[PDB]
Ligand binder design. Structure first.
Ligand SMILES: CCOC(=O)[C@]1(CS)N[C@H](C(=O)O)C(C)(C)S1
Ligand SMILES: [Zn+2]
Ligand SMILES: [Zn+2]
Length: 219
């Protein structure tokens, strides 16, 4: 038995959802995403691993009076996209980058119904921004920025204590992508990783250090 879906308030209008999955060779893996509230509407920043937990997460906010206006997935792995199929079946708009949707399609997985293409994209103008720092953990990984809270969801790109699975990684680009991320969000109040605890902007520095060290160790 895996731990249950957790939902925890992080800031005004910002909640961290944590789901858990058994991943062969990694044991029980936690995955953090966000739910962001704008007025009476809720946006999912990454879906939980599974449809079950995506439904639980949606139910919780609907029962509390928030309409689910959409989800955005930060990269194509199923810890960010596992609930897209279920959201689509409920006519809740799902978003992912063009490249993320291409990689879903290539793996025979359900795609988001909406795609965006380019370095920056406003999911909600002035409230929820999407930014592509370049390849790192995967070729498609993006981050999500909440300007009114100075909170950055770094997703599986933020790796403060070790890079993790390099199977889909672009280790030669990750240092550059990490330097770009740090220079753009160096003033973030909070940085939310997918697989470790929330921290401050130093998680940007630590990530860059881990990327540079990972590229060095591949000699
Ligand atoms: C489907 C299970 O796989 C995953 O969804 C991830 C996506 S990042 N794979 C990673 C890895 O293999 O290191 C992880 C940190 C274990 S979680
Ligand atoms: Zn991943
Ligand atoms: Zn991940």
């Amino acid at each position: 038995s895996l731990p249950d879906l957790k939902i925890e308030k992080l800031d005004e209008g910002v909640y961290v959802h944590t789901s858990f999955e058994e991943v062969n060779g990694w044991g029980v893996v936690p995955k953090h995403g966000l739910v962001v509230l704008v007025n009476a509407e809720a946006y999912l920043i990454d879906t939980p691993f599974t449809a079950k937990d995506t439904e639980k997460l949606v139910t919780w906010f609907v029962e509390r009076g928030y309409k689910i206006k959409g989800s955005i997935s930060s990269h194509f792995h199923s810890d960010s996209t596992g609930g897209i199929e279920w959201l689509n079946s409920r006519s809740i708009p799902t978003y992912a980058s063009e490249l993320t949707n291409e990689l879903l399609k290539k793996d025979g997985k359900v795609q988001a119904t909406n795609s965006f293409s380019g370095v920056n994209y406003w999911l909600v103008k002035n409230k929820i921004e999407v930014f592509y720092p370049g390849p790192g953990h995967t070729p498609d990984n993006v981050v999500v920025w909440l300007p009114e809270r100075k909170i950055l969801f770094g997703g599986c790109f933020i790796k403060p204590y070790g890079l993790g699975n390099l199977g889909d990684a672009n280790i030669e680009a990750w240092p550059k992508s990490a330097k770009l991320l740090k220079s753009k969000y160096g003033k973030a109040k909070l940085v939310v990783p997918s697989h470790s605890e929330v921290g401050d902007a130093s998680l940007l520095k630590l990530t860059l250090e881990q990327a540079v060290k990972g590229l060095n160790e591949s000699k």
